[PDB]
Design an enzyme around this catalytic site. Structure first.
Site, short mmCIF file in Angstrom:
data_model
loop_
_atom_site.label_atom_id
_atom_site.label_comp_id
_atom_site.label_asym_id
_atom_site.label_seq_id
_atom_site.Cartn_x
_atom_site.Cartn_y
_atom_site.Cartn_z
N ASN A 120 61.30 76.02 23.19
CA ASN A 120 62.15 75.15 22.65
C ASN A 120 62.01 73.61 22.57
O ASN A 120 62.20 73.00 23.73
CB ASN A 120 63.49 75.94 23.30
CG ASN A 120 64.77 75.05 22.70
OD1 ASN A 120 64.86 74.72 21.47
ND2 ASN A 120 65.73 74.69 23.47
N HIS A 145 67.78 62.33 31.11
CA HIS A 145 68.13 62.54 29.67
C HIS A 145 69.64 63.33 29.41
O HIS A 145 70.27 63.45 30.60
CB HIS A 145 67.22 63.17 28.89
CG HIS A 145 66.85 64.77 29.17
ND1 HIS A 145 66.07 65.15 30.18
CD2 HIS A 145 67.09 65.83 28.42
CE1 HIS A 145 65.74 66.29 29.81
NE2 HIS A 145 66.51 66.63 29.02
N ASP A 163 70.68 70.37 31.86
CA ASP A 163 70.02 70.51 33.30
C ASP A 163 69.79 68.93 33.97
O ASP A 163 69.21 68.87 35.10
CB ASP A 163 68.72 71.04 33.00
CG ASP A 163 67.66 70.32 32.21
OD1 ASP A 163 68.16 69.78 31.25
OD2 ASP A 163 66.77 70.97 32.00
N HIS A 175 70.57 66.42 28.21
CA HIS A 175 70.85 67.83 28.22
C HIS A 175 71.44 68.39 29.72
O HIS A 175 71.58 67.80 30.73
CB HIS A 175 69.35 68.62 28.24
CG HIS A 175 68.73 68.35 26.82
ND1 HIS A 175 67.35 68.59 26.85
CD2 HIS A 175 69.35 68.46 25.77
CE1 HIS A 175 67.20 68.44 25.44
NE2 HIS A 175 68.18 68.47 24.64
N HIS A 202 60.06 64.96 25.15
CA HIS A 202 61.02 65.97 25.33
C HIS A 202 62.27 65.58 24.66
O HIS A 202 62.98 66.52 23.87
CB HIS A 202 61.16 66.41 26.57
CG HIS A 202 62.27 67.39 27.09
ND1 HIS A 202 62.28 68.81 26.71
CD2 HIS A 202 63.73 67.29 27.41
CE1 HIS A 202 63.36 69.34 26.90
NE2 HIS A 202 64.24 68.18 27.24
N1 LIG Z 1 67.36 73.87 30.76
C1 LIG Z 1 66.11 73.90 30.14
N2 LIG Z 1 65.19 73.12 29.82
C2 LIG Z 1 64.13 73.74 29.48
C3 LIG Z 1 62.94 72.66 28.96
O1 LIG Z 1 62.11 73.02 28.57
O2 LIG Z 1 63.08 71.45 29.47
C4 LIG Z 1 63.89 75.07 29.35
C5 LIG Z 1 62.87 75.92 28.74
C6 LIG Z 1 61.86 76.11 29.71
C7 LIG Z 1 60.74 77.25 29.50
C8 LIG Z 1 59.92 77.18 30.66
C9 LIG Z 1 60.30 76.55 31.77
S1 LIG Z 1 61.75 75.89 31.57
S2 LIG Z 1 65.54 75.48 29.67
ZN LIG Z 2 66.02 68.52 28.26
ZN LIG Z 3 64.69 70.82 30.87
#
Ligand SMILES: Nc1nc(C(=O)O)c(Cc2cccs2)s1
Ligand SMILES: [Zn+2]
Ligand SMILES: [Zn+2]
Length: 231
Positions: A179, A83, A87, A85, A148
């Protein structure tokens, strides 16, 4: 043992062998005052390697390429981002500079552009509708529906029964959605259900963040998402 967030300094990348010819890569990065771990996948593709997702930023993705060369020794020639984002696409410019051809669905490429994120070079046709799947060398790419994010893909390695769920699948120890800005909370449970239906044989399930599990992560994730739907 699978490496955890406190064990990976930001800027370093670990590889974890899941099955023959299948690894996850694990990195760490800061978001909003905390550091999180993040997973992607590496799959043998004949004499080459197929990368699933960046290691969440340019420095981390450079360390990923170096650890792959040190540990595996075959070239990374293609990458798929699951996706839009950071990451998933952060570090795409490093990959491009290293000679990797980078790929994403047209939906991911549009969303990355709106957001100002790095944009994979090539568009993956055939993934626009819920339930769509395409072969990409040693893996099948699957668009389960919005979850997500509206574009999130999952990736299955048939030779090994490995399902990479990306950020639509939470690790068991995660009990809060946290989030969910770009999520579709009403569609997420149904998209998870399409994953379960299409990949019932999955032996290993890798979340986008945290420890691998099995298919139990799917129902786990659902319950965590509905707990946010209700309150
Ligand atoms: N780059 C990031 N993606 C996410 C996600 O939720 O995909 C984050 C929040 C997280 C909370 C607990 C583990 S990851 S940060
Ligand atoms: Zn994401
Ligand atoms: Zn993520």
């Amino acid at each position: 043992e699978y490496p955890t967030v406190s064990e990976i300094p930001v800027g370093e990348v670990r590889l974890y062998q899941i099955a023959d010819g299948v690894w996850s890569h694990i990195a760490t990065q800061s978001f909003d005052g905390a550091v999180y771990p993040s997973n992607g996948l590496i799959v043998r593709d004949g004499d080459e390697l197929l990368l699933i997702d960046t290691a969440w930023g340019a420095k981390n993705t450079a360390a990923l390429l170096a650890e792959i060369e040190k540990q595996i020794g075959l070239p990374v020639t293609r990458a798929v981002s699951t996706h839009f984002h950071d990451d998933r696409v952060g570090g795409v410019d490093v990959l491009r500079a290293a000679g990797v051809a980078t790929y994403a669905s047209p939906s991911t490429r549009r969303l990355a552009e709106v957001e100002g994120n790095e944009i994979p070079t090539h568009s993956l046709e055939g993934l626009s509708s819920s339930g769509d799947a395409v072969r990409f060398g040693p893996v099948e790419l699957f668009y389960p529906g919005a979850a997500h994010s509206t574009d999130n893909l999952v990736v299955y390695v048939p030779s090994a029964s490995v399902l990479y769920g990306g950020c639509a699948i939470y690790e068991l120890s995660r009990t809060s959605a946290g989030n969910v800005a770009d999520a579709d909370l009403a569609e997420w449970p149904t998209s998870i259900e399409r994953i379960q239906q299409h990949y019932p044989e999955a032996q290993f399930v890798i979340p986008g963040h945290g420890l691998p599990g099995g298919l139990d992560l799917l129902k786990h994730t659902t319950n965590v998402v509905k707990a946010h739907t209700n309150r």
